[PDB]
């Protein structure tokens, strides 16, 4: 019932419709992780859509999404931010976050102001696993005005997670696989030199996906499974 409910449903639906389609240049492949990028410059602004897939043993989609969304563990895995805070809590599954990013010479420092929502998308019936999604997308908020010290990036990011699993036995983490699709469409919000930006992305996206997925595996190991 919060004021962004209509926008959230639009953003989530568009991801479920378009973000799972099969793709674009391979940036890196390492184990089960594949990172792809489409080269796109629009009016000189580098928009380069990013899409990655991964298959992570021993964690569920619900777990992966909880850890990606939960701001309390953010600093345990995220390495590209200087500072962040929660501007507003909209619902138990929806918050607005302001954050500033590490500065990359020679461009101005970027900041971002986004709604971050976590949603369970049921299967047709409970015979099949639900999909979990976290969507982070830019919004306006009067408590976080555009400022003169940072260039305001505009983002649409999603992490979409599918969970793949004898007699009376218990399910073990060794027999669960989480298939992750991560998409990032980032508008840097102003001019940035293309070569510099592209080198940063090439390095930082795979770094993040490795670090983040390893983190969840480490923190869930030996804990009861949250489906
Ligand atoms: C050490 C250098 C790093 C500096 C970072 C540059 C600024 C980035 C601009 C905003 C990107 C938005 C990131 C998305 C964040 C959230 O959804 C989420 C929680 O924070 N994290 C990720 O998805 C994890 C996403 C990890 C993203 C890293 C890739 C960076 C994208 C490149 C865009 C370049 C921005 C222009 C800066 C100047 C370039 C010359």
UniProtKB/Swiss-Prot annotation:
Cell compartment(s), UniProt: Cytoplasm; Golgi apparatus; Endoplasmic reticulum
Outcome following mutation: residue 99 to A: No effect on ceramide transfer activity
Consequence of changing residue 105 to A: Reduces affinity for membranes. Abolishes ceramide transfer
Highest taxon of source: Eukaryota
Binding site for an N-acylsphing-4-enine: 78, 99, 136, 182
Domain START stretches: 8-221
Post-translational modification: Inactivated by hyperphosphorylation of serine residues by CSNK1G2/CK1 that triggers dissociation from the Golgi complex, thus down-regulating ER-to-Golgi transport of ceramide and sphingomyelin synthesis.
Tissue-wise expression: Widely expressed.
Subunit architecture: Interacts with VAPA and VAPB. Interaction with VAPB is less efficient than with VAPA. Interacts (via FFAT motif) with MOSPD2 (via MSP domain).
Primary role: Shelters ceramides and diacylglycerol lipids inside its START domain and mediates the intracellular trafficking of ceramides and diacylglycerol lipids in a non-vesicular manner.
UniProt comment concerning the protein's domains: The START domain recognizes ceramides and diacylglycerol lipids, interacts with membranes, and mediates the intermembrane transfer of ceramides and diacylglycerol lipids. The PH domain targets the Golgi apparatus.
Disease: Neurodevelopmental disorder with hypotonia, speech delay, and dysmorphic facies: An autosomal dominant disorder characterized by mild to profound developmental delay with hypotonia, delayed motor skills, impaired intellectual development, poor or absent speech, and behavioral abnormalities. Some patients are non-verbal and non-ambulatory. Additional features may include early feeding difficulties, poor overall growth, seizures, brain imaging abnormalities, and dysmorphic facial features.
Protein name (database record): Ceramide transfer protein
Taxonomic placement: Eukaryota, Metazoa, Chordata, Craniata, Vertebrata
Gene: CERT1
Entire protein: shown range: 364 to 624 of 624
